[PDB]
C-alpha cells in the first residue's frame, strides 16, 4: 500500500556516497535510488510507504548531514 | 499468438543522468511472456535469453534482432511519445 | 573523458533479501543508480561506470544469496 513517493535528499558525503546509497537502498519501501546533479551530491529515492523522517534521521546518524529538497507523489 | 498491442508495459526505471531509452522489449519462451524492460533504438545490448547470451540489435523503429535460442524471442516496440 | 555509462541487470533470489541486494549493489564503487525492475520486481538494474559485473555477482552470491547476470549494455549518449 501507498501512493508512489519521490524523495530528493541533499547529503554532505566526504570520505560516504557509497554509505548514503547503501543506507537509502536498504530502507523499506525503496524501489530506486539514484545520484542526481552534475556533482552527484543529491540522492533521489522512489518507492511506496517510505518514511522520510526516519530516513533523514538515519542518514544524519550515519553520514552527518542530510536535508530534504523534495517530497512529492511521483 | 504474440500480440504486443495486448502486453502490459514493463516495470522500468529511467536513470535521470542518461538519455531515456526509446523502446520496450518483451521476452517470450514458447509465446509465454517471461519478462520485459527498456532498451535504446538504433543500438545493441547483450542479454541472457534462456541458457544463452544473445547480442540484440535494435533499428530506429525498435525492431530487435538476434540469434535467439529455439523457443525464445525478444520483441521491441516504441515507448509512448518516441 | 568520453566513456559511456554501463547498464547491468541482475536477477536476485527472494527471502527475508531484495533490500540486502539493493544495499550491497548501491554500496559498490562507480554506481549511479539501482532500481528494482521486472515483471516480478526481482531484477536490479544498475547504472554507473567502472563496475566489474563478475565481481558484483560474486559479492552478491557471497554476502546475500543466489544471483544471475542478465544484461550488460552501454548507455546511448550520442
Ligand atoms: Cl539498450
Author numbering:
A (entry chain A): 185 to 199, 202 to 260
B (entry chain C): 32 to 113
C (entry chain B): 184 to 199, 202 to 263
Structure paper excerpt:
Intracellular nucleotide binding, leucine-rich repeat (NLR) receptors are key components of plant innate immunity pathways. The integrated HMA domain in the sensor NLR Pik-1 directly binds the effector AVR-Pik. The Pikp NLR allele only responds to the effector variant AVR-PikD, but the Pikm allele responds to AVR-PikD, AVR-PikE, and AVR-PikA. Here, we graft an interface from Pikm onto Pikp by mutating two residues in Pikp (Asn261Lys, Lys262Glu), forming PikpNK-KE.
